[PDB]
ATP synthase subunit s, mitochondrial (Bos taurus), 175 residues
Amino acid sequence: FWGWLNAVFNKVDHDRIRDVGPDRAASEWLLRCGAMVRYHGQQRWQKDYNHLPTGPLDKYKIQAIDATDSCIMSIGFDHMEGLQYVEKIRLCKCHYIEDGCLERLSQLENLQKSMLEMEIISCGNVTDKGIIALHHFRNLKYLFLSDLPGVKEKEKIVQAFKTSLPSLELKLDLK
Ligand SMILES: [Mg+2]
């Protein structure tokens, strides 16, 4: 219904993966959902889906992800599985991101190593539960929560992190 496309765009094309390998596949899913990515090695952000590197075989790993105004959703997070090197993620004004998404991510082993830096800005459906789940990123050096109206017991988050990730810089920007 006037938006089935969301399912089409979030579909996971395991064939494509196995062909051109996870990072490439995940860059197509992302940019086609109005996200951007940045490969280890470059300063340029990939932002135009049609300009994606389609030659230099299998050298581009994904390192930072910017979902602003994006239409990604958890039925598609299988794209995030075989990603070895992701260090940054920014989620901002993404309507369909919420607690379930944050769980799924925070349970991706490959990401639990690689992640250093996360920001959740202005995503209305996320909550305290979703946030706390983020402790499983054992290497997370910094995490910015801003404009998250679904988050209530802030202070209690600050504690959980204080204990389970003692040296995480934890910028807050909450009501
Ligand atoms: Mg966008």
User: Anything to note?
Assistant: Residues 34, 68-70 surround magnesium ion (CB under 6 Å). The two ends are 36 Å apart (CA to CA). The chain has one domain: 1-175.
